[PDB]
Amino acid sequence: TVRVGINGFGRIGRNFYRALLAQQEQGTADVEVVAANDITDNSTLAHLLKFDSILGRLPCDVGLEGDDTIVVGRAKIKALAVREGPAALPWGDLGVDVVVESTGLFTNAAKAKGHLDAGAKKVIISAPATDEDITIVLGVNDDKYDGSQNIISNASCTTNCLAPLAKVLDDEFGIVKGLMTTIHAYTQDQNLQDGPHKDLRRARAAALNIVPTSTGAAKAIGLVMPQLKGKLDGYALRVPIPTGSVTDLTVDLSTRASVDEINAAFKAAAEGRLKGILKYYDAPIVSSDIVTDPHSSIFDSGLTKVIDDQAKVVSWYDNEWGYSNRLVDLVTLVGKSL
Amino acid sequence: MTVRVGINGFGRIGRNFYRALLAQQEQGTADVEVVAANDITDNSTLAHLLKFDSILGRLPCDVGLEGDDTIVVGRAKIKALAVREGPAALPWGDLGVDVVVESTGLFTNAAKAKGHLDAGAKKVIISAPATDEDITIVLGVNDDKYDGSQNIISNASCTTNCLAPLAKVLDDEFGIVKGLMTTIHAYTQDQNLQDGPHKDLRRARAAALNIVPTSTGAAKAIGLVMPQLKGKLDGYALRVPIPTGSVTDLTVDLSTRASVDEINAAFKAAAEGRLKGILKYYDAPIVSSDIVTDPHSSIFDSGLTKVIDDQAKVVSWYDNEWGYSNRLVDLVTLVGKSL
Amino acid sequence: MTVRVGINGFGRIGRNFYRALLAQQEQGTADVEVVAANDITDNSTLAHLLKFDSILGRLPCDVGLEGDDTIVVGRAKIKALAVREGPAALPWGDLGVDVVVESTGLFTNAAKAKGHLDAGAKKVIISAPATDEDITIVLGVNDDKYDGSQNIISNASCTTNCLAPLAKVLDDEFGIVKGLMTTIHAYTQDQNLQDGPHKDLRRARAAALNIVPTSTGAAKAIGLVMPQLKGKLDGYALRVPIPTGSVTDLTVDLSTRASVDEINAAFKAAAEGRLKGILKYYDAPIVSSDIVTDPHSSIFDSGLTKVIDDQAKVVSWYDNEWGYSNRLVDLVTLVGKSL
Amino acid sequence: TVRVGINGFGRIGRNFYRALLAQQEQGTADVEVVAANDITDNSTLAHLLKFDSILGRLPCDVGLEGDDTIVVGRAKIKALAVREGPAALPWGDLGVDVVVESTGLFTNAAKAKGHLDAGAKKVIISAPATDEDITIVLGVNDDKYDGSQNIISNASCTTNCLAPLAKVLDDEFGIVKGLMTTIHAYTQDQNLQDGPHKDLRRARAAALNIVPTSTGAAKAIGLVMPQLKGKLDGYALRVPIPTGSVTDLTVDLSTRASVDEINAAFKAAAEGRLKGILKYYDAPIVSSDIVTDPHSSIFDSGLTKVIDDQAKVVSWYDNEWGYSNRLVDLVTLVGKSL
Ligand SMILES: NC(=O)c1ccc[n+]([C@@H]2O[C@H](COP(=O)([O-])OP(=O)(O)OC[C@H]3O[C@@H](n4cnc5c(N)ncnc54)[C@H](O)[C@@H]3O)[C@@H](O)[C@H]2O)c1
Ligand SMILES: NC(=O)c1ccc[n+]([C@@H]2O[C@H](COP(=O)([O-])OP(=O)(O)OC[C@H]3O[C@@H](n4cnc5c(N)ncnc54)[C@H](O)[C@@H]3O)[C@@H](O)[C@H]2O)c1
Ligand SMILES: NC(=O)c1ccc[n+]([C@@H]2O[C@H](COP(=O)([O-])OP(=O)(O)OC[C@H]3O[C@@H](n4cnc5c(N)ncnc54)[C@H](O)[C@@H]3O)[C@@H](O)[C@H]2O)c1
Ligand SMILES: NC(=O)c1ccc[n+]([C@@H]2O[C@H](COP(=O)([O-])OP(=O)(O)OC[C@H]3O[C@@H](n4cnc5c(N)ncnc54)[C@H](O)[C@@H]3O)[C@@H](O)[C@H]2O)c1
What we know:
Four copies of one chain form a homotetramer. Chain A is α/β, with parallel strands linked by helices. Chain A folds into two domains: 3-132, Rossmann fold, CATH 3.40.50; 157-319, Dihydrodipicolinate Reductase, domain 2 (2-Layer Sandwich), CATH 3.30.360. Helix content of chain A is 25%, strand content 25%. The first copy, chain A, has seven helices and 19 strands. In chain A, strands 12, 13, 14, 15, 16, 17, 18 and 19 form an eight-stranded mixed β-sheet that branches. In chain A, strand 3 and strand 4 (56-57) form a beta hairpin. In chain A, helix 5 crosses helix 6. The longest helix of chain A is centred in the first third of the chain and has 16 residues, at 11-26. Chains in contact: A-B, A-C, A-D, B-C, B-D, C-D. At the B-C interface, helix 2 and strand 3 of B face helix 2 and strand 3 of C. The structure holds nicotinamide-adenine-dinucleotide (NAD) (4 copies). One nicotinamide-adenine-dinucleotide sits between chains B (8-14, 38-40, 84, 103-106, 127-128, 157-158, 188-189, 320-321, 324) and C (194, 196-197). The PDB classes it as oxidoreductase.
């Protein structure tokens, strides 16, 4: 059993824990979480884990003690008082193998190495990192991971959806250039009301309007697909929706492909080399049908449009549940190396 | 010389047209006057929905009622609303109505919309993409193509009044080879509040609980107002939990490789020149809340512009309710200037 | 040995009733089976609305179609939906339907609901307050008052199924002199997405853009299930931008002076004893998002309980879609046991 | 012109400034804002003031410089760098007479006295205070303010609505006791997603559910109406709405009155002693008709019900715009004593 410790038991931290529990019920997971770190007490963390506004209530019973939270008889050391850097957490004492860094403040590998120095064997950053050992999207460049990587980045949720769509289009037809627009759900980093913020777009009320923000999912596509480095760029549009997002990639193809050709190539890729990561839809679905869906990219074949050499591909993705299931699959791949 | 206007369908677009007409009269840039309104409800409900609005708030004028006419302020509008049959049953000729604004949504076909003309109307303006209409007009694009020989007039969609100025500037300055569109739109009344039956299984879902991808012909029928771009554009729509206010995201391949500053300066010159009042230039990090109750038909956001070689992505905001209705008022004044 | 059920109105309550039946069948506490569903749409839209739900997510079972029948998983439900007329036109006897769950909302009057009985149904359950019905039953309150001689059975409001357990515990333990309630309800399909015509000018406004205060007969008609409280209770409703999930706030004057701890202890004993399955006791800081997809009729929130002398305010949550539909499942199983 | 300095240019602060500008356009205002403090640069404050998600765009042009933000012909020194206590802000150097405390962290008069030490003549806290000189609700106990008060508070947004309703009910029929439930708009103190918070109820997603929270609006009614001290109590329920709230007071009356009697007493009070504070409405209005309404209490006569002596009175109020107009009117009343 791979011992995992979460740093930042927020939305992604609790989604990773719930996806790990669901994947253990499905049998495709072996790691267990033994520690969680956050800037709050165990009572608040246990209440936020039991009652979720988006994922509902947890089927297991959740209890507390004095420093640990008890779920299904299992116990997780709520080592949350560590308000300093990641090197202050006692991962070595708890025997934690893989650490899921999900605070949002330690995206730099120079800082993210504090987990490794504290006793951890490997670190998985749940966001685009800097100076990281490798940026992995499960199903795209997961084969490029040997045993010589410790600061591993699962990239962004948008990157985990754009990479499969761009991989199929480039490997089957070739990508000359593309511009994407991900229509994203609002996240905790936005303001509920009009208040100060480093981003004047996300400074506005998140639930009252649509805030166009930036993203590095397309500009950093070379981190997982080096042949597409500098060929993609785009931004994001935060809509009043809790979870569930969609990517709208408009790309010029090297070879002219029809709508039927692109849809047939995505259907064969979803049921083959990308089975479990990419899913093919021929049904008129909405984002409510994407909430709690573990797939990284949900290709919507109905919204495909092609003129001459320019093609628009639309693919859904759950920014919380789908990305956390990839963090579970990545923690299992790294745990297989430990 | 006041043009007499009659509204068929006093819904969201109908009341926004009356409010934009009243606001343009207070500004002095309007001469038409609405004299009649028809719906499928009594005059008390129409007067209440006009006074109290969830998006535009309360009306600054007092609103009263009688038995067959609704009185705003020093103004009387014959609430000829009992006419629930075809458009020919309405007494447009008896009431002396010059221009009829069709805003019900069920009379988009010019074959049925011709009943207004048979009923005594001089010109008919459909507030939606029509079929077999005399002309499809987008103010600021092909408004000059309207002479005196048109009676069944149409004003295209809310999305079209935003895409057309953006594609016109890009083609006149850099040339458009082909482009694809995704308009992020506010939800409209034709959507269901909860999951219920609907001809569109996408719009059948809860409008405020998710994003419904639906189809649109704004880009596919761009040749109706820009024949040089006919068949060069296509796209769809994505309804989001917002009452009013939408945005268009056009990714287009250009004939000539242009820079970000070139595209922004070209749109800025158009907004300050030939498209003053139709296109607006924004160099500030704005959001859709700033677009609510904005009379412009296309609000170009220069900060969201991106380009790769010749492929450019242009983002432009527009209020699908207020901005479109102000264009309907300007179109009614243009039609009144002919007859 | 399986009681055959047919749903008239496969809307929100209709699909929630079918999903609650399937979940109760997987738990083993249900024997009735739904064999027919009538709606104003084809079987394709019915299967799509059943498979994909905006609140309840996707169905774990696979859903297929044919030409007139929608196949769940192994089971087939005749989508007898062409019956767009009154409830007497549906062929319940030809389909062999024993109990009919009326959930269209347009056939709440017993003069219409009797059409199911004339069509071959043995018993009818209206998922709403009815007029001139045989009996109005709230499970856990007056469920004993049902003998074999009732056919026009009506389950009360979702608000009544939450207010009745509160008023029952308060009256049986402390006595109720008078009370005034205010239920904070989620928006429902009968409201408008934008400002449009409606019989209720309050519910005529945009449901998700504001809070619409509407009236309700939940508290005024409590005497139908507790005669000792007839006329002693009254209240209204306040629709808030929420898909599913509501809460009741009952301010009641008690006959005997009781403390906050005494009221919470009596409700905790009732939830753990006489009202196990209908009333739930919560000592955790819960919100309405913790109430969605909860089968309990009333979820008493002990933290929000307050009293001043003999005036007490009791707060209890309830899921107006899922929790109410489970009570329709239990009522259909009880009536099916009477056959 | 009364010199005013804002400490906390957030939602309430910018609502106070916009209400001051609108009241100056109406002609019934003389105060002028000269400073603003907000733990963010002048550029973010100028952008948040020009563009509002609820109040729309500002009709005046808004520009910036290096430390001051320009309205139109008016320049306001954005003294926002004062990140320490209120005693460190230079109110005396700028010549500010009255200071509007709107941060929410200096409600206690022990810390709020820093404004007076910094050179301010009077202090107006935009929230319930502790150890304050006097708690004033305009239209109720505003006459109890002489020149011998320096640290004044305007109570809560809910109190400014319950006080007129409780005053009319007590002066006409008498109040034995009452329990209220204010259905409130969500505010900045709530979380957008499920995250840690001092209040586990307000820790949940504010826009995805209703958060029941406590309030001292009814419990502290004795600060402005001593005869009702301890006779009123209630809580709050935050609903997914940006601005605009409503109070639902169920109160036992000393004399059994009818629905027509209570509605007639409220109509005469709104047309008499409470003209400008209480609004009477006979139309089926909703909260969208209450947004941006300067009244302190909008009595809805249609939602009134009675049985014996227990009556339920419903009154709307805009927690943002209406409360800020009461702050503007209070600043004009306090400035009249200088
Ligand atoms: N859908 C998504 O939200 C999503 C998707 C992909 C990636 N990510 C990335 O994952 C990370 C987490 O996202 P989220 O939405 O769950 O964020 P969140 O704000 O909901 O949770 C972040 C957590 O960090 C905690 N934290 C803050 N300071 C800390 C400290 N000093 N030590 C420990 N914990 C601390 C917070 O208290 C909170 O629990 C971010 O980097 C985000 O960009 C998020
Ligand atoms: N809503 C927008 O932003 C927008 C933008 C562009 C175009 N449009 C189009 O404009 C049209 C109207 O839009 P809306 O939002 O005002 O629609 P709506 O459904 O909100 O209002 C339509 C009105 O027509 C009335 N009506 C129904 N049947 C009628 C009949 N037989 N005779 C007369 N009146 C009748 C209805 O009662 C209602 O008042 C539609 O075609 C719509 O697609 C809407
Ligand atoms: N929504 C709730 O939470 C809730 C709770 C308790 C009771 N109810 C009651 O349920 C009924 C409405 O259910 P709902 O609001 O959940 O969903 P809904 O409005 O979708 O239910 C009605 C359904 O009946 C269908 N239908 C079938 N035959 C029909 C016919 N001949 N004419 C018209 N429609 C027909 C409609 O198409 C629709 O799908 C009302 O009686 C309401 O008071 C609803
Ligand atoms: N929100 C309402 O509707 C409402 C109504 C009545 C009273 N109030 C009360 O008014 C106060 C402010 O409410 P709000 O909604 O404007 O709050 P907010 O959090 O939205 O805004 C407060 C502002 O204070 C600024 N600020 C200045 N100095 C600060 C410092 N040292 N530390 C942190 N922030 C600092 C913040 O940057 C922010 O802009 C609170 O006491 C609140 O309870 C609010």
